[PDB]
Design a protein around this ligand. Structure first.
Ligand SMILES: [Cu+2]
Ligand SMILES: [Cu+2]
Ligand SMILES: [Zn+2]
Ligand SMILES: [Zn+2]
Lengths: 151, 151
């Protein structure tokens, strides 16, 4: 309801624990992802909490409003579009995102969906090519986990 | 949501995929678990979809009505009390459960909670000790996963 958690795992070395907390009409996303290459990595909620085929079965970006892909600060974005996390030289990205569109309740609830961190930076839907309007050219899914209710 | 899914894993060899489907006011639970010892094994929805410390962080049986532990056919049961799955001599359990109390939406939704399969049979709350009324003496948590929305 007010707190959620996600453990991201994959076939490679990328892992992390993400926490979610409802604050006013926002959700605060914190935690850290480890094992990344230094630099930016796309970071989105995908539609399905389905880990039967790794991160592949998570489906596309959570997009209940049928909008094009964007950055978290854009009006035109998927609900799940949380932009980029940035990993330091040691491969650690400290996640600190305050987002007004995702929710832990109601129609926009991300409970039971999947958090995904990507191989490449998210171009935030500015590129204008076809792939940018769906995924932001973030490339493959390095690690993922199902978003669960937390104590 | 009308469909849900769970991938079970643990520290040992126990693995399986559980599927959930809403039909009217019931949820149909199906799937398979391998790597179990022969015989019965407790099978419950636990409160938190928190895998940060393996199955230990899932918390207790999901219990919004503050009842004692029981079997799924009892009124005096936890919402998460789905009884026993049964593994054959080869360690394979076929899951086939129809339950009217768990739900995939609303107040008793198990989306974002944790499915857990246990070391020992669930005595269904009729073991005669204080432990029976809490866990059914199912023992340790062999494998678990967070319940996610499925396509
Ligand atoms: Cu993504
Ligand atoms: Cu249990
Ligand atoms: Zn997107
Ligand atoms: Zn119970």
């Amino acid at each position: 309801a007010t707190k959620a958690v996600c453990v991201l795992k994959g076939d490679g070395p990328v892992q992390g624990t993400i926490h979610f907390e409802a604050k006013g009409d926002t959700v605060v996303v914190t935690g850290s992802i480890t094992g990344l290459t230094e630099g930016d990595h796309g970071f989105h909620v995908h539609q399905f909490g389905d880990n039967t085929q790794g991160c592949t079965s998570a489906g596309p970006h959570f997009n209940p409003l049928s909008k094009k892909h964007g950055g978290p600060k854009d009006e035109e974005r998927h609900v799940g579009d949380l932009g980029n996390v940035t990993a330091d030289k040691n491969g650690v990205a400290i996640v600190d995102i305050v987002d007004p569109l995702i929710s832990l309740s109601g129609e926009y609830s991300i409970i039971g969906r999947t958090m995904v961190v990507h191989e490449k930076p998210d171009d935030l839907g500015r590129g204008g090519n076809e792939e940018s309007t769906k995924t932001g050219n973030a490339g493959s899914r390095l690690a993922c986990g199902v978003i669960g209710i937390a104590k």
